[PDB]
Ligand binder design. Structure first.
Ligand SMILES: [Zn+2]
Ligand SMILES: [Zn+2]
Ligand SMILES: [Zn+2]
Ligand SMILES: [Zn+2]
Ligand SMILES: [Zn+2]
Ligand SMILES: [Zn+2]
Lengths: 361, 361
């Protein structure tokens, strides 16, 4: 009882797998709304990947038709599309670089290819990098050589957060995000999950990694789920893909941390609302808010109701806090386990006049 | 030609002197709109000062009746009101502490009085401090002892920005603002202005102070004019009050710096839009934007048309950039030297449902 009104929360790192069995825009944005999230940024490592104008055009129409909450779509860097995205770049959330193991169309085989993208992508638009361990230092070098900013995805190690800390003390334009599974899970949990389910990139860290992220909360600009819904069949199979589902558990876990005094409510809103807004130039959502009950104690079940992943690595954890109601642009979108907006209610925020990134003419 | 669309800019530090000859809400917010500013935070050192509930109630009605753009009103800390503002605190922009020379009702005569305010002001609401030189270090200590954040007004010296830099490297929750006269004026200009006009608190810095602020732009969270309109009669008189008018010159000066590559357009928008939003929890303004012409060269005249100060210390400086049009909540508010919204069109953003600061119940 006694609900708290939050602004519409933003998750800047989700995999909705459309262009489907793992998840689609309709089911993924339903999981988002149930987690208090009213706007998401979808990553480009789909099949086909979003690495050129026709693929983005297709993805945009599928999301406009399936999305239940508002969204923006990332473009993906490839070994061949550097210098070809200028005309559509402004319509995307930003450019995503996969600098570690991917074995996909987004594989870059040389740091020179990184520079070509930093040099050709419009300088006023966001660039985001999946960069682990020393790769974070390498991409920061490229960002400095090209005299522009970069945003580092899912920081998970003491090594990574301390380097970002050192870069920020030197005044370099770097921001970063951390995912809930790197704040609330560690190696102490791999025994329970197993090597199939516990497969994620970046991998789970040690207790020292987790403690370092919490100790350096001041260095973390954003929280983002890295929603990577894979079915249990794939996570437990021979070659299990990496990633966890997390849209529905992100806010409950972090509200639990707030109730325990680990971070303040403001700390949470900076990292799930204000900083995502200003890093990716995402527009406000009028008449949009989330109502949470901070008193409700519950246990995370074997699977959350909406994500098609049908499993969660936070099973059994005790949480304090739940989303009671979500209103999106004047309409009740979610209430106590039911989503009440149809697929297609969501819109591409980059098409809004206030959602375009300002630039010099 | 070729205009750029900016979001509604926010100035979190203005003196509008109502509850009038120096300036009132009507003329001050006109100067604001002509400077591309659609929302202002007014300081409490008026006559009477805003240091209790009846004074705030009065000021709120005067602003609602005179303001041409949206606003929030600061409460002022005094030697007697600690622990008495709890019921109205949420209706104010924040709490303003004057820790240096003021000889007014806002004079605090002991650091213990600072702590009492940090201890009694609601922990989720903003506290802002006028703190110069070592006072910045002292108020940071108080903020640490009371385990909360603080925002430092108009940083003007190498000494101050380096200490804030060191505090942020230690992870302390401190943010700060800088005013245009401390980025574009120095001791080299006091010869022209004289000791009467050149009187400002914080005083103008050396060239080394100015260079240090620019070199440490990464440490500056906000730009704010510290609009302190005093008539030429007072600035040139026996005991001249401190402060400059700056609402109408802030954006042109900073756009000049952008055109010269001293900072990026994004750097500007972070410090005049996004960061003011998230530090003071100010709501968005729907259907609001500013159109600027970045090509227009002009010279700052002896006085700008709207501010009742009728003088400016930037006289003669060559600038590149001008505000062509301002739209505030769906109405043309300003166009090429004419304000087209009447006194009273502006609203108190703290009364908006989205303008209240979220708190734990
Ligand atoms: Zn739609
Ligand atoms: Zn990744
Ligand atoms: Zn990812
Ligand atoms: Zn009004
Ligand atoms: Zn001051
Ligand atoms: Zn002031």
């Amino acid at each position: 009882a006694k609900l708290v009104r939050l602004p519409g929360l933003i998750d800047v790192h989700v995999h909705l797998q459309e262009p489907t069995h793992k998840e689609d825009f309709a089911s993924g944005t339903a999981a988002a709304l149930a987690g208090g999230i009213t706007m998401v940024c979808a990553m480009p490592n789909t099949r086909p990947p979003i690495i050129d104008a026709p693929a983005l055009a297709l993805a945009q129409k599928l999301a406009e038709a399936g999305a239940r909450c508002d969204f923006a779509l990332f473009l993906g860097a490839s070994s061949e599309n550097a210098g070809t995205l200028g005309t559509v770049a402004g319509s995307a959330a930003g450019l995503k670089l996969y600098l570690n193991e991917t074995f996909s169309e987004l594989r870059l085989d040389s740091v020179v290819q990184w520079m070509e993208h930093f040099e050709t992508w419009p300088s006023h638009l966001p660039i985001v990098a999946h960069a682990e361990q020393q790769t974070v230092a390498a991409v920061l070098m490229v960002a400095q050589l090209t005299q522009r900013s970069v945003h580092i995805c899912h920081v998970a190690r003491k090594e990574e957060i301390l380097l970002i800390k050192a870069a920020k003390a030197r005044g370099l334009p770097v921001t970063c995000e951390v995912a809930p599974h790197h704040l609330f899970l560690s190696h102490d949990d791999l025994e329970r999950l197993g090597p199939g389910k516990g497969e994620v990139r970046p991998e789970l860290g040690s207790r020292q990694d987790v403690e370092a992220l919490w100790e350096n909360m001041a260095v973390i600009d954003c929280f983002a789920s890295d929603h990577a819904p894979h079915t249990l069949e794939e996570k437990c199979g021979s070659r299990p893909p990496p990633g966890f589902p997390g849209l529905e558990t992100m806010l409950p876990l972090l509200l639990t941390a707030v109730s325990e005094g680990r971070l303040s409510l403001d700390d949470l809103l900076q990292r799930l609302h204000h900083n995502p807004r200003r890093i990716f130039h995402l527009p406000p959502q009028e008449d949009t808010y989330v109502e949470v009950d901070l008193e409700h104690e519950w246990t995370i079940p074997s699977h959350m109701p909406f994500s098609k992943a049908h499993w969660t690595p936070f099973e059994g954890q005790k949480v304090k806090g739940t989303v009671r109601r979500v209103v999106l642009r004047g309409e009740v979108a979610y209430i106590d386990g039911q989503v009440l907006v149809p697929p297609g209610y969501g819109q591409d925020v980059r098409k809004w006049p206030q959602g375009a990134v300002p630039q010099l003419p």
